[PDB]
């Protein structure tokens, strides 16, 4: 019983002026997890807080990129173990469901 996993990442792209949504493909994949992690680790250094809202200036949308892997296990429940290991090996550890990992 070759199981499947769904590693999902969330994002929200700034809509370009008069662009077909078929563009956002790029806008979607240019901003993967690693990029989000190093962007958070980089802004922290010169980060200053201000109450004044800058979020209400433009129009944009929210979307998700999910990828899927597969594995075969002789045992039913052992699969998850491997998954977790592999996640720690190459992926972010989101919340887990039955298999689905969500970071958002």
């Amino acid at each position, epitope marked *: 019983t070759t199981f499947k996993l769904a590693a999902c990442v969330t994002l929200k792209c700034s809509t370009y002026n008069d662009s077909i949504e078929e563009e956002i493909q790029r806008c979607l994949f240019n901003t993967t997890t690693e990029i989000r992690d190093k962007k958070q680790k980089a802004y922290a*250094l010169f980060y*200053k807080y*201000d109450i004044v809202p800058l979020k209400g200036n433009n129009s944009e949308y929210i979307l998700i990129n999910c990828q899927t892997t597969t594995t075969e296990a002789v045992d039913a429940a052992t699969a998850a173990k491997v998954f977790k290991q592999y996640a720690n090996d190459n992926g972010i550890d989101g919340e887990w469901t039955y298999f689905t990992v969500t970071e958002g």
Partner: antibody
Amino acid sequence: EVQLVQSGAEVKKPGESLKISCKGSGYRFPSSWIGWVRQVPGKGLEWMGIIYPGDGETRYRASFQGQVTISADQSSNTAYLQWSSLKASDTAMYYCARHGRGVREVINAFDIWGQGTMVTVSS
Amino acid sequence: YELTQPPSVSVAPGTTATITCGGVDIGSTLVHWYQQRPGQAPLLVIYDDSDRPSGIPERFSGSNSGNMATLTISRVEAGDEADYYCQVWHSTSAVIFGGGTKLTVLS
């Protein structure tokens, strides 16, 4: 326009203090860092210092510590750089540049630049 | 922490140019790219590695990998000749600039 304007060029002698300015318009002064960068003619860019006026926080370079001073007048939306004593090695073009404060909406790099001010020290 | 930019870069007009910025584990941070024409203030042409300020055409692309950042220029025009610098914000060293790379469009 979101713009920054720097004071006029100056020629001085070693030992005399000097203060130069950077006045920005078109945006909220305290919501953005102001950085000062040095460029000896024919050489790279040398980041000297940076100031956040909202808290008055300042951060300098190891080398440019004892030499220079940075100030921020929030009331006039103005940044200032100063030497107590000048040297020859300080002869260069000086640039002041705005820098986002670490928010996704703003640009987190030196987006707006000034015209630059030439400081020439020669006995 | 130093940045290794190449001194000179030269390509023919209308061809794609690349500019390199070598850092130790540089992929673990965000690199920005600035343009400076001789005698004029610098201009932010790329930030967050790939993003483009307004008024910058699609001709400018950026990328970053483990130990090498790249800035790519498509449809090169004689108007893009100038000095290009890479810059980061290190955990300890604050702001660092690349040595600077002169780009020339061949005449």
